[PDB]
Structure formats: structure tokens, C-alpha cells
């Protein structure tokens, strides 16, 4: 709104909060990103290093559905199933192990960031990292691949 606006307290003050010596004029330094290499170079180099130039190869017809690979860590691996399911098979660690299909939950690759509870689990994902698998193998369980 305009009730709490700053212009309401600038009534009566001549320069309206913009100085008498240096008045408020129409773009005293250029419009937009002007002078990014000449007179705004210090600002561009100090706060946006790398802004000028080219880096890397070009991909003309890039389709984001081709590189779509959502990932999930092991600390949030059991979030794909109910809490009662993780507890029910904790009392039965002698072979009956739950299956966590990560593909049907919306992820492709499994990364081994967090710690896994000491329960055998069958993890079905399209991709696995080296450490994610060995933490699943170390805790008991297999890493089934899916397409």
C-alpha cells in the first residue's frame, strides 16, 4: 500500500531523498547492464566473476527429459516406505526383507550419503553409486538394477 510508503514522509523535503548536488536524473550511468566492461567493470568483476566470455561445449537441441536423473541418498531411503514397515521387518532380520523400489517413487540413482539402519533391504534403482551399494551390501541386502 501507500500508507506506510516513504514518499509520504518526503513531502516538504525538496530533493525528495535524492540530494541537492547530485540530483536524481535519467540513468546517470547507462541503462541496464551498460558499461559492464568499461565503467561498471569493478562491480562486475567483484560480484560476478566469470560473467564475460565463453566456457564449454554447446548442446543445440538439449532436451531435459534425456538428462533427467533424480537422485536420493541412503539417509532418506527408508522414507519411501511406511515407518511400520521398517519396524516390522526389524524384528524379523532372518531373511524376510522389504523391497524399496526407488524408481516407482520418483528417483533413478541412489547415493550413499547417510547411514543405513541395520536391516537387510532390497533396493531397486536404475543407478547406484559405488558407496551406496557397499553400504547396502555391508548392512545386508542387494542392489537390484532396473530399466
Amino acid at each position: 500500500p501507500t500508507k506506510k510508503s516513504k514518499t509520504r514522509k518526503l513531502r516538504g523535503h525538496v530533493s525528495h531523498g535524492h540530494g541537492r548536488v547530485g540530483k536524481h536524473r535519467k540513468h546517470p550511468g547507462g541503462r541496464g547492464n551498460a558499461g559492464g566492461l568499461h565503467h561498471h567493470r569493478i562491480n562486475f568483476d567483484k560480484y560476478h566473476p566469470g560473467y564475460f566470455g565463453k566456457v564449454g561445449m554447446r548442446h543445440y537441441h538439449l532436451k531435459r527429459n534425456t538428462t533427467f536423473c533424480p537422485t536420493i541418498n541412503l539417509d532418506k531411503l527408508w522414507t519411501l516406505v511406511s515407518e511400520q514397515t521398517r519396524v516390522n521387518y526389524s524384528q524379523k532380520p532372518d531373511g524376510p526383507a522389504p523391497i524399496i523400489d526407488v524408481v516407482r517413487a520418483g528417483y533413478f540413482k541412489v547415493l550413499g550419503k547417510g547411514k543405513l539402519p541395520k536391516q537387510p533391504v532390497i533396493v531397486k534403482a536404475k543407478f547406484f553409486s559405488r558407496r551406496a551399494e557397499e553400504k547396502i551390501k555391508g548392512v545386508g541386502g542387494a542392489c537390484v538394477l532396473t530399466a
Binding site: 540513468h27 550511468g29 547507462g30 541503462r31 541496464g32 547492464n33 551498460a34 561498471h40 562491480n43 562486475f44 560480484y47 560476478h48 560473467y51
Partner: protein
């Protein structure tokens, strides 16, 4: 123009955009219009399903 640390903005407002501004003030009116069209179509195909 740049004062301190901030994004390098790129507002695409260098054309005559004021000549092409579509306000969605008839959005609730087209909901009533599209709803009446389904009801009007439903009576025309009364036994047949309206979804097609």
C-alpha cells in the same frame, strides 16, 4: 546502475509490451462459460457420456 552485490537482471521489457498485455479478468467468467458449454453439450448427447 549496479549498486552492490546482486543479480544481473534481464527484464525483457524493451519492446512495446503495453500494447500486448492480456489480463485474466475473464478467467472466472470463462469457467462459467466452459461449464455451461459442458452442460449444454450434456443435454444434446443426453444418454451418451459428456466426456466424449
Amino acid at each position: 546502475a549496479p549498486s552492490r552485490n546482486g543479480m544481473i537482471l534481464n527484464p525483457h521489457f524493451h519492446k512495446d509490451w503495453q500494447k500486448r498485455v492480456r489480463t485474466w479478468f475473464n478467467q472466472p467468467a470463462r469457467k462459467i462459460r466452459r461449464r455451461k458449454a459442458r452442460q449444454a453439450k450434456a443435454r444434446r448427447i443426453a444418454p451418451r457420456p459428456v466426456s466424449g
